[PDB]
Amino acid sequence: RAQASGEVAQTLTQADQQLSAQGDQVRSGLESSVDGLSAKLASRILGVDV
Amino acid sequence: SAADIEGAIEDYVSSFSADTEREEIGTVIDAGDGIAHVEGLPSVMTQELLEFPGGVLGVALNLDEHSVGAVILGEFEKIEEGQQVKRTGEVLSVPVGDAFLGRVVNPLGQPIDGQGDIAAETRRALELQAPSVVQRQSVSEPLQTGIKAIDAMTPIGRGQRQLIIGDRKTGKTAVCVDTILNQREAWLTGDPKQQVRCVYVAIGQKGTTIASVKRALEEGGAMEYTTIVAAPASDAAGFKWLAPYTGSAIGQHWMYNGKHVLIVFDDLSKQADAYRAISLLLRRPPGREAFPGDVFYLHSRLLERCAKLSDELGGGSMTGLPIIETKANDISAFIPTNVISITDGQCFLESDLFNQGVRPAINVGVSVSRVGGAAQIKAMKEVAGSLRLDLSQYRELEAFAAFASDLDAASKAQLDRGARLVELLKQPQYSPLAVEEQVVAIFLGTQGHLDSVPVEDVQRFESELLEHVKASHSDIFDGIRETKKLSEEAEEKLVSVINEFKKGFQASDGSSVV
Amino acid sequence: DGQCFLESDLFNQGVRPAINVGVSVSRVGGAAQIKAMKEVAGSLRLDLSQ
Amino acid sequence: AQGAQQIQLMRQQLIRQLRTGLGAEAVNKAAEIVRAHVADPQAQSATVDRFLSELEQMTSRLRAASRQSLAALVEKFDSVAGGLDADGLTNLADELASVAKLLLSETALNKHLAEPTDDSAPKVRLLERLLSDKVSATTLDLLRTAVSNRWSTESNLIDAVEHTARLALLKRAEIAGEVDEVEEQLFRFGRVLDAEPRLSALLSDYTTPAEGRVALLDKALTGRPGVNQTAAALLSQTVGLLRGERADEAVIDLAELAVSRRGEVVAHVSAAAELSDAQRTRLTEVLSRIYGRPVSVQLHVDPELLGGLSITVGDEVIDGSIASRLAAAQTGLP
Amino acid sequence: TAGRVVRITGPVVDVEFPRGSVPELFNALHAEITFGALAKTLTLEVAQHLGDSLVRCISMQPTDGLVRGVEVTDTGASISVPVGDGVKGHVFNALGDCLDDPGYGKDFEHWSIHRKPPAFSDLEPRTEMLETGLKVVDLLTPYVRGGKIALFGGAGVGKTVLIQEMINRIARNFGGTSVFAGVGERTREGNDLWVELADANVLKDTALVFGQMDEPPGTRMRVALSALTMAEFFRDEQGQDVLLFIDNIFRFTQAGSEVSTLLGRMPSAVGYQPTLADEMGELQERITSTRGRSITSMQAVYVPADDYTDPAPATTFAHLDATTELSRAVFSKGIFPAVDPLASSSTILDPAIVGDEHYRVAQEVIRILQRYKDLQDIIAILGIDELSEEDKQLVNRARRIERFLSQNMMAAEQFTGQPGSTVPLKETIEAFDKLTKGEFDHLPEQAFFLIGGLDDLAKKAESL
Amino acid sequence: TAGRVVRITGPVVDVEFPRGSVPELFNALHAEITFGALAKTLTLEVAQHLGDSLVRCISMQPTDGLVRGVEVTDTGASISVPVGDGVKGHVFNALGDCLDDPGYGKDFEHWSIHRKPPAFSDLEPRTEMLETGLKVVDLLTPYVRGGKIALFGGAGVGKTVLIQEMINRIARNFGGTSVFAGVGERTREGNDLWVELADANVLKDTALVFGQMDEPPGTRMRVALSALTMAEFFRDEQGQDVLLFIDNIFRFTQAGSEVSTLLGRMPSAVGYQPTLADEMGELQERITSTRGRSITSMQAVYVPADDYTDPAPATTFAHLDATTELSRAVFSKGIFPAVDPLASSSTILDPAIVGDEHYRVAQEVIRILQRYKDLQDIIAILGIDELSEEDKQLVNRARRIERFLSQNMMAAEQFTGQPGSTVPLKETIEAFDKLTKGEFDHLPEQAFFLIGGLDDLAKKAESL
Ligand SMILES: Nc1ncnc2c1ncn2[C@@H]1O[C@H](COP(=O)(O)OP(=O)(O)OP(=O)(O)O)[C@@H](O)[C@H]1O
Ligand SMILES: [Mg+2]
């Protein structure tokens, strides 16, 4: 039990670090795609091509 | 990874459309204590879902010529005079599907466990009619609760409403969690006609207690077939009122699809309090203990959903295990009386028994299951037939345990048999027993094979024997679970194993049992 | 801060002023007594309750 | 396995929160883009035109007894006013308002006149002996009809007579030909009052003498040279018999009654800017088609909408406003 | 002429009608719920006239989905239930709608469920006895023809089997009929009773009227009256003796209390309706013998808190003429009909009504079976040998007396195959006079179990 | 923009605002009283929106002197209280006004008293025992570190003495921060606590918020939330371990009931407000600890009429991990701390957490005490001699166990004179294992009374 719990905790810490790094990495391309996403959203809430 | 992320926001942007349609608007003319009165909405229907500007929701529960009294389902602090109220046009409905297994959901079906959204197969309104008399079937399939006391003396059959009634900290939630856990061996079978799906409606319970129940189910592996409809004490009275109905709807979707469901409610005493609060705030006339006139209708409408459907409707079932917290063990209070009348059986868990070491504290004799032997497998029925009479005689004779020197041989035999049967019905928490092991235990007790073991050791004996039979003579358990009866060919072998094991047992005082 | 529960049963029994020693209590306690009476009567109430 | 899952669900929660942030940023950028675009008058007019095109494709508080009594009384006013002229209508309205003031002042008179009875002869006799010579003859028929029919409660009687006192003026505007002008005017006085909460509150005759309230109104509101006589008279009558109803809601309800008399229902319209009579025409025709009755449009111009119009009539609303669309897009995001 | 719903407050609906068309009290009005999921035709029962053309009504069906301003059409008569020989063999709800054959009975004659009891001049002045043919009932607790009998019991004591027994006996001895008023009937138990009666082939002689618990309080309050109207039709029109079961009457009282609370009436006593006695009398006093035919009634009564002074039982028992208490002790000992001979009581068991010999025999039996109960403690603790010769005689005689009160009940014909036994009252009196005197104490105890009479007892003796 | 007082009724004040400026619920409004000695600035908290632009508010200070028509200004934000490390070592009232140093915190960060509880995703059960040094608490109802503890009791059974003792036992050597919420408690006890903490130098790590009973209902409602807001700031914004002492949490609901009827709500159960459970949940769920950041709350709950079935204690019981129940029955005997060993319970008392020897000893003690509570009546009427030998010896053990569960607590030296004592958990569990096995059956009962441990037990036995 204790090894299972220790292994789970270690992998949880490692996964937290790795996934946090991966998320902020991908947020970079997120801020690129945001421009097009917002343009198309505007062209929807307006009902005509922006 | 990045492909998925924006994938979704982009998809929103696209599928998103400029909805523009007639809508009926009211205005909040009065708000307070979880109730908001809405002028307007002429087409509103009773128990309709209204949405207020801040994403808040409420239920149009009173309709007068002047205003609509709506109970606000949380986030009440964001309601103001003059805010627009927009009617959804649909009565309360909750999503339902197989995706709710392993999830914790608020009474509206929105997940609160922090995991992803739930793939809702369909929506069911919280007020659909219960199965009719013609759509039902006789309760005849056991629902093994794993508690020797319940399964032997107050059996629950699939489709029954077995109330668990007791004072605080007496073993109610423990009994229900043991019942939920005991269904894992049936779940792993993969046969829908044996699987029992569980819904644990938590009402007015502190968040950490629901988390503890979730951990208890998860460590025992029962979360993969259990859904928690959590309405913690922090939520408005509306959620504590609707949680039983959201659990009933989730269970009913499976019930009508042919699955078998077990619906637990800790506690209907807290749902009734929530409804009382809502009614008094809405100024509905109060009756006994300030409850509104239709509290019995509340609980009956909730519990009459539980039923076993005829084979024409798929043959599914929904078994209720309402939990009600009496005060000072006064089963005559209003809500306890109502539920005792509604339910098909009662398990009276008393604190005096709990302190005396009887756990799970079920007061045999007063606790009954009107379904009776029809909810037991043949083996359990045959073994436990004598159990109730023996325990009644023991409770009659217990005053004589002091002066047994002067008792008749038969009377002393009954006293000693009962003193060991009561130990036999004890059971540690989170340790449910499969039906075959219960059969073997009550067989030890009733046939008298425990009459030689000291009362102090029965619990250990029964354990060390069952384990032994599980390890070296698993044939008995296989026969019992496959045939549902304890035949003579297997009974003789079981007695032989009992006598073989009794030689190897060392009672706690050092004596020898043979 | 306290209570001197006078009971009719004690009054009739001849216990006058009729202070029910058990239910009665003074939460200031010894701090409201001169040191001498604190020393002599420190445990008197609990002794009488017992 | 539990730990595995927990890390997989942590990855999915990372995905969900990153998507939430992306959606929030996209919503902010789209809102900025649309607000910048709509800033141009041509774009705003185009949004209003599309809104109109999309739309193209699309006494109640009285209880039963008072409802029937007021219905009968209005029936009467119809016949009685069918003969009177403009001066006759003015005299009728003034006398009806005066008797309404008398009823309001003497609470005991109200009660016993409003109290229902199978035979109304005592009430009719009381009304005759107390007002027959004082007021014009035509007022007597209306007041007898009012005191004859059974009212749900005493207060309703006042609401009856005052109502008739209003109708007269409206009928005057109907015969003089300013029915639309008086309604428009009332609406203008409405917002005026809505723009001065202190003025509306101080106009509560329920707290101060009615004559003082009317003098305040004259010095403040009806003294403007361009005010129509009918609208000023209606507002003075209403404020002088306000009886606790907020002067604002009173005058808006008066405008509602003015339009209802003509059989049309007014739709309150809010927009970032007025939109030409072209608009009015097309929008009025569209709303009339949707609601199957002639409709009047009142423009509550406000830049908050940031684009298309938001319309409300009765309990129903058409909401294609750009602000509402931004709110919908923001809420619908994951 | 149709009204409009102005208020919805739970099961209470206020309807505003035109000035001259307000419905009279207790009229059944129909309203439409048109929401797709909950489409329904609400049947509202006018409870009060609030004035200004408003009538307050108790919805007999859930109001979830009702809309203000929805049209309400007045039927012009109280809730009407179907009546006739055609209602036998079918299950109805409180409103007269068939549940096992929807649309059934809508062409039958319909009777208002509100009707005054028989005129005072038409009431029978003498309390005749209903000789059912059961030894225990006929001897110790004689049922009153046209009276109300409490039926205490529970699960596993054969209450349903006894109900079948009485249905069979009223059908085949008195040529009558039974109407089962399931007030507050658990849907599971309702279906179980339906299938049990169908299997026993007694449904054809029984009209079932279930007001289920899940239904609002109104139907639970009106189901007893609906079943009672069916029984009254069978009595007055068809001239049949009727046996009307009610399970449970306390739930009729509870539904009345809930309706009273909903309509804003101040509760009395322990929270019960102020009109408790009037409602209970209007229900019970219609259960009477008139013009020669009689509606006997067996009523399962629940005593809250085990308090016979609680107003619900305290008012019910003013109308009950007998009490039959099934016990799990007697049941476990193989005695069917499972009637506890000592807890059960009957108010017609006096020599003025029953014969003097009957009273003497019954009192002797009660004396014996009470001694035996007193000596049961000695037997179970110190053994039978601890008793004296006289006591042991008495115990051996009481065993046979209590086992002879058992009977091969008619309802058992479906299980044991052997026909049921109807012992005439005289034969029962003579048999128990012989049995208390010890004239049959030499026979084995097994000779008395489930034996229908005296000659049958010989033949189970010579067979042993 | 400012409002106007329209109606004053005790602690409830109605304010009419202009249509466009009706304050939001729970916003703080300011009014002014100008009369001499009562002159002040009156804080009101909007409770309801009555319509017609009116709001109904609860007054934090007494409304005596307030005048109809007085100007009311809206603050635009709910009542806010100071937060930060600076609140440690100082005394505050409900509104956040420092008492010992007026105007101290008017520049600190201010947090709204009203906030939602932590999301369910963040809540994790706590199962770490907290060793207190008291025999009864550490044995029968062990306390949970980071969980919720309560000290139930009737009027004057020692809740305040025990809560002060627990402050002395946990907080005195606590590494983190402590917050004490004197919710409607006696002011003398609060001042004694303040001086005691100052003398022991614990005050520097404690923040005190007093809403004592001399203050009107609204401030009694909101003092608990203010102290809890400080505790939440310490939990979330600093990740520190926090002790949240409260006395008495019942006063929150009692104040709610006091203003319930004025505010327009119909009353529920025994005079309580309908929203009792809702308010208690909204306050209690905020006290929960979340994963990685702990609050060890231990809140005294007052039981009205010494009736544990009263709605307020009954509702409070659900929000608690450990429940030490004081009873006047035990207090009347002299068994200080007056803990009822039986009714008192704890969630952490399981064999998986506290051990398997601790659990056995505690459960055997409970068994013995329950048996001696069922034998007490027989003893009082029949006599101890009439009992069995086993029951007699068990009664001796039970009396000794009851007296040994008593302890001379450190903060109750004004009660008993002698100094306090701490019994380590292991020593307690061995002491009670010995007692339940008869190892001390020969010592006199008085040897176990108010004696802290085995060594002191031997000393007192030798003294006697
Ligand atoms: N069979 C059992 N054996 C031993 N301990 C048990 C058993 N059942 C319950 N307990 C313990 O009893 C205490 C109360 O149990 P449980 O959580 O079921 O309470 P409950 O009666 O549902 O009350 P509530 O939810 O009101 O606190 C807990 O310590 C639980 O561990
Ligand atoms: Mg529980």
Side-chain angles (χ1 to χ4, degrees), chain B residues 168-175 205 266 270 325 354 359-360 427-429, chain F residues 346-347 349 359:
Chain B
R168 64 168 290 263
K169 295 292 184 186
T170 314
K172 310 182 284 287
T173 309
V175 160
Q205 295 198 316
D266 197 349
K270 293 173 174 68
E325 173 188 8
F354 183 80
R359 335 290 255 268
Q427 187 160 5
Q429 189 183 228
Chain F
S346 184
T347 52
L349 189 81
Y359 183 67

Side-chain angles (χ1 to χ4, degrees), chain B residues 105-166 168-177 179-184 186-248:
Chain B
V105 310
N106 61 9
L108 282 171
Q110 301 157 358
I112 62 169
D113 52 33
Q115 298 166 223
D117 291 331
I118 293 142
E121 292 177 36
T122 308
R123 312 195 60 97
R124 284 191 95 265
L126 298 182
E127 294 294 328
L128 271 77
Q129 42 195 339
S132 179
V133 295
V134 287
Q135 288 169 313
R136 286 183 192 230
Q137 172 166 90
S138 303
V139 175
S140 56
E141 312 180 8
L143 179 70
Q144 310 298 348
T145 63
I147 309 300
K148 279 172 281 178
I150 305 187
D151 272 17
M153 313 205 60
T154 78
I156 314 182
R158 294 181 193 212
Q160 192 172 321
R161 292 81 51 70
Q162 190 71 4
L163 172 73
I164 312 303
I165 176 170
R168 64 168 290 263
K169 295 292 184 186
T170 314
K172 310 182 284 287
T173 309
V175 160
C176 282
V177 170
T179 300
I180 292 166
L181 286 157
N182 197 57
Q183 315 310 323
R184 181 152 209 265
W187 175 259
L188 298 177
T189 300
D191 185 4
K193 294 181 176 67
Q194 292 173 69
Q195 296 190 325
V196 179
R197 299 171 172 209
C198 303
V199 188
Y200 184 79
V201 180
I203 306 161
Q205 295 198 316
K206 70 193 297 295
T208 299
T209 291
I210 299 167
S212 182
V213 169
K214 193 198 178 198
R215 290 226 316 180
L217 295 172
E218 204 159 65
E219 293 179 353
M223 201 66 203
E224 64 188 304
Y225 58 83
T226 297
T227 302
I228 298 175
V229 173
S234 48
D235 290 334
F239 279 165
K240 300 204 276 277
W241 164 52
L242 294 174
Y245 291 103
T246 297
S248 300

Side-chain angles (χ1 to χ4, degrees), chain F residues 281-349 351-376 378-384 387-434:
Chain F
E282 289 162 27
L283 171 56
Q284 290 280 4
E285 293 316 290
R286 285 175 62 180
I287 294 167
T288 56
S289 59
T290 58
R291 57 176 37 100
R293 50 192 75 250
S294 88
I295 295 176
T296 302
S297 70
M298 182 278 288
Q299 44 189 251
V301 181
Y302 168 89
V303 177
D306 189 358
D307 184 1
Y308 273 96
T309 57
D310 183 291
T315 306
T316 305
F317 278 126
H319 300 91
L320 293 172
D321 296 318
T323 289
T324 299
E325 290 196 26
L326 312 186
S327 74
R328 200 183 301 287
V330 182
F331 182 82
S332 184
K333 300 177 201 300
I335 307 284
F336 247 83
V339 181
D340 179 342
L342 300 169
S344 172
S345 67
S346 184
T347 52
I348 191 167
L349 189 81
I353 313 169
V354 290
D356 245 332
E357 165 68 47
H358 185 167
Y359 183 67
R360 193 193 72 250
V361 173
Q363 289 301 332
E364 182 67 356
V365 160
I366 282 161
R367 206 268 299 181
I368 283 159
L369 290 175
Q370 180 65 50
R371 182 58 176 180
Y372 165 60
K373 214 183 82 188
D374 302 346
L375 294 177
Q376 263 172 45
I378 299 161
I379 289 157
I381 297 169
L382 281 153
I384 195 156
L387 297 172
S388 179
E389 184 59 32
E390 183 168 46
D391 282 320
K392 192 183 291 183
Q393 159 188 9
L394 172 144
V395 162
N396 295 351
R397 301 198 226 275
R399 289 173 69 72
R400 291 172 170 69
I401 286 158
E402 292 181 354
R403 276 149 190 67
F404 197 59
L405 289 161
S406 177
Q407 175 155 4
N408 50 331
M409 295 173 291
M410 324 200 83
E413 267 135 49
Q414 46 72 39
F415 282 160
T416 302
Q418 69 186 122
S421 66
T422 59
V423 185
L425 169 60
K426 182 174 72 68
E427 178 166 334
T428 305
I429 300 154
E430 108 180 313
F432 281 94
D433 204 2
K434 276 176 204 213

Side-chain angles (χ1 to χ4, degrees), chain B residues 305-397 399-405 407-415 417-460:
Chain B
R305 311 294 173 62
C306 303
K308 192 169 201 309
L309 307 177
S310 57
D311 293 275
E312 268 79 10
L313 294 180
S317 75
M318 184 165 101
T319 302
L321 259 63
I323 293 161
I324 74 161
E325 173 188 8
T326 53
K327 287 154 188 43
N329 202 44
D330 185 314
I331 62 170
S332 83
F334 197 50
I335 302 302
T337 296
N338 299 345
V339 185
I340 291 162
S341 56
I342 297 169
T343 52
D344 305 323
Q346 296 83 48
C347 301
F348 297 91
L349 283 72
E350 311 215 312
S351 187
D352 301 62
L353 269 63
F354 183 80
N355 291 333
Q356 276 173 12
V358 188
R359 335 290 255 268
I362 292 142
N363 186 17
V364 168
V366 298
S367 51
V368 73
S369 66
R370 296 174 64 93
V371 175
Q376 291 174 310
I377 61 170
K378 180 67 174 66
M380 183 81 84
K381 201 191 303 183
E382 184 188 17
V383 65
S386 66
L387 186 63
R388 184 166 274 267
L389 183 63
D390 291 353
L391 279 163
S392 178
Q393 289 171 350
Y394 174 64
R395 293 308 185 181
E396 286 185 353
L397 273 69
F400 294 92
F403 339 111
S405 66
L407 271 168
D408 182 26
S411 186
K412 184 178 184 293
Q414 280 168 9
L415 183 139
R417 172 66 63 71
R420 288 163 176 75
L421 288 171
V422 66
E423 295 302 314
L424 181 68
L425 295 187
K426 293 192 197 200
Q427 187 160 5
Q429 189 183 228
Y430 306 140
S431 179
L433 285 180
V435 68
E436 49 262 20
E437 310 186 37
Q438 304 185 48
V439 166
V440 162
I442 319 298
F443 177 97
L444 265 62
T446 57
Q447 305 307 294
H449 298 98
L450 286 176
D451 280 291
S452 45
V453 180
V455 60
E456 293 179 353
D457 306 299
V458 170
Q459 286 191 241
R460 188 162 57 82

Side-chain angles (χ1 to χ4, degrees), chain D residues 62-65 67 150 152, chain E residues 4 16-17 19 51-53:
Chain D
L62 304 174
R63 286 157 63 151
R67 206 182 305 138
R150 58 186 299 123
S152 296
Chain E
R4 305 178 309 114
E16 176 193 87
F17 284 90
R19 181 62 176 84
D52 307 317
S53 304

Side-chain angles (χ1 to χ4, degrees), chain E residues 168-246 248-281 283-284 286-305 307-324 326-349 351-360:
Chain E
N168 286 291
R169 283 174 184 296
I170 204 80
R172 297 212 314 232
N173 295 0
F174 300 86
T177 298
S178 179
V179 186
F180 193 102
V183 186
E185 182 65 26
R186 305 167 174 88
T187 314
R188 184 189 61 73
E189 288 193 0
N191 168 84
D192 189 358
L193 179 69
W194 182 50
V195 301
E196 275 182 20
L197 299 198
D199 293 352
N201 210 40
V202 306
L203 197 80
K204 79 190 193 303
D205 316 309
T206 300
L208 297 174
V209 188
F210 291 151
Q212 299 162 203
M213 272 171 198
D214 53 299
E215 300 182 352
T219 56
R220 309 202 312 274
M221 182 179 72
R222 296 310 185 202
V223 66
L225 279 71
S226 171
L228 184 62
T229 308
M230 299 210 211
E232 281 218 337
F233 178 91
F234 286 135
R235 186 192 63 207
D236 294 341
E237 276 283 28
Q238 306 273 348
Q240 299 184 18
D241 286 3
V242 188
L243 186 70
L244 181 144
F245 299 86
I246 308 187
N248 195 304
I249 203 76
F250 168 77
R251 289 197 281 262
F252 167 85
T253 292
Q254 193 194 43
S257 163
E258 290 170 11
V259 171
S260 177
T261 301
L262 285 170
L263 295 165
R265 298 164 205 170
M266 294 177 71
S268 63
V270 183
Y272 293 109
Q273 58 271 44
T275 61
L276 174 54
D278 291 331
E279 289 173 19
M280 197 68 210
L283 169 54
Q284 299 281 25
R286 289 165 65 178
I287 301 164
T288 54
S289 52
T290 178
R291 255 185 306 261
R293 310 278 71 184
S294 59
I295 294 161
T296 312
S297 179
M298 284 183 45
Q299 308 183 7
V301 59
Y302 174 77
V303 298
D307 181 11
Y308 282 80
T309 81
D310 215 328
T315 301
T316 303
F317 290 130
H319 296 279
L320 305 193
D321 310 320
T323 289
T324 290
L326 313 182
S327 48
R328 277 281 319 160
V330 177
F331 178 79
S332 60
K333 287 191 289 181
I335 292 157
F336 316 137
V339 175
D340 191 297
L342 295 174
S344 70
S345 173
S346 175
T347 67
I348 190 167
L349 185 86
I353 317 288
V354 291
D356 202 3
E357 180 180 18
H358 184 166
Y359 183 63
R360 182 180 59 75

